[PDB]
């Protein structure tokens, strides 16, 4: 056989711990470059952590960059540690991340299509 079809996607990772309030996503998103760039970050006001899906794979850039040292990646290089959730928990956040960005971008047309 030699073939994998189990179907297990997970391009979103989350981090929790010391979180900053002024830092910006542009600064941390650039740090994950050269090893998985960030595609989007969803943080809830008053939350204790945050999730970030990458353009190539959060589990890849997060577990790869998270592994670069101890195995837990910190956010902003000294703030929150991120770890990929499970198929059930990783997906629950993946869907919420889409609904959050869909409302942040908004659409102006009403023409149809």
Swiss-Prot record:
The chain holds residues 225 to 334 of 408 of the full protein. Sera from patients with systemic lupus erythematosus (SLE) often contain antibodies that react with the normal cellular La protein as if this antigen was foreign. Binds to the 3' poly(U) terminus of nascent RNA polymerase III transcripts, protecting them from exonuclease digestion and facilitating their folding and maturation. In case of Coxsackievirus B3 infection, binds to the viral internal ribosome entry site (IRES) and stimulates the IRES-mediated translation. Interacts with DDX15. May interact with RUFY1. Transmembrane segments: none annotated. The modification N6-acetyllysine is found at residue 107. Phosphorylated. The phosphorylation sites are at the C-terminal part of the protein. It is found in: Nucleus. This is Lupus La protein. Residues 6-113 form the xRRM domain. The gene is SSB. Coiled coil: none annotated. It comes from Homo sapiens. The modification Phosphoserine is found at residue 4.
């Amino acid at each position: 056989h030699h073939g994998s079809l189990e179907e297990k996607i997970g391009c979103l990772l989350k981090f929790s711990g010391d979180l900053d309030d002024q830092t910006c996503r542009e600064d941390l998103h650039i740090l994950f470059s050269n090893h998985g760039e960030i595609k989007w970050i969803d943080f809830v006001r008053g939350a204790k952590e945050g999730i970030i899906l990458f353009k190539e794979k959060a589990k890849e850039a997060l577990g790869k960059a998270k592994d670069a040292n101890n195995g837990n990646l910190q956010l902003r290089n000294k703030e929150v540690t991120w770890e990929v959730l499970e198929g059930e928990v990783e997906k629950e956040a993946l869907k919420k991340i889409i609904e959050d960005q869909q409302e942040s971008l908004n659409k102006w047309k009403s023409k149809g299509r």
